[PDB]
Amino acid sequence: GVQVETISPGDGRTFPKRGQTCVVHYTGMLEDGKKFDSSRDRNKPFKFMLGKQEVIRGWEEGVAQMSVGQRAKLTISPDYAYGATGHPGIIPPHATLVFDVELLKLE
Ligand SMILES: CCC(C)(C)C(=O)C(=O)N1CCCC[C@H]1C(=O)O[C@H](CCc1ccccc1)c1ccccc1
C-alpha cells in the first residue's frame, strides 16, 4: 500500500478530486535515503491530473489523502510503484519508494 506520514499540515478541507490537476513539489528517495529525483532541485513544481493513470498507483492513492498546503512522506510498496520491472537504470526491481511530497495547489 502507501503510508502517508505528515511533515506539515494542509488546510484540512481541500482534498484533490478526480479530474483535478495537482501541483506538487517532490523529492523521491530509496529506503536508504538516496535521492533519485526532486522537482525542488529543478525549482519547477510537477503537475499531474488525478485519475488519469499517468503517475504510479501509490501517488493516485496517497496524494488524494492530502489537503492543499500539506507536506507528507509517502512510503510506497513496490506493487504500488514499479513492481518487478523497476524503472530501467533508476529504480531497482522490487523497490519500496519514499516520496517527500508537498501539495501546493489544485488547478
Ligand atoms: C520522473 C520519473 C522518476 C522515476 C524520476 C520519478 O521520480 C517518479 O517515480 N515519479 C515522478 C513524479 C510523480 C511520481 C512518479 C511517477 O508516477 O512517475 C511516472 C511513471 C510512469 C509509470 C506509471 C505507472 C507505472 C509505470 C510507469 C513518470 C512520469 C513522468 C515521466 C516518467 C515517469
Q: Tell how many strands the DSSP assignment holds.
A: 6
Task: Give the percentage of residues in beta strands.
Answer: 35-45%
Q: Please identify, by name, the CATH architecture.
A: Roll
Indicate the percent of residues in helices: 10-25%
Classified by CATH, the class is Alpha Beta
Q: Give the overall silhouette.
A: globular
Helix count equals 2
Domain module tally: 1
Membrane topology: Peripheral membrane protein
Pfam family, one: FKBP_C
Modified residues (N6-acetyllysine): 52
EC number: 5.2.1.8
SSE arrangement:
Layout: E1 2-8, E2 21-30, E3 35-38, H1 39-42, E4 46-49, H2 57-63, E5 71-76, E6 97-106
Antiparallel strand pairs: 1-5, 2-3, 2-4, 2-6, 5-6
PDB class: cis-trans isomerase
Keywords: CIS-trans isomerase
Assembly: monomeric
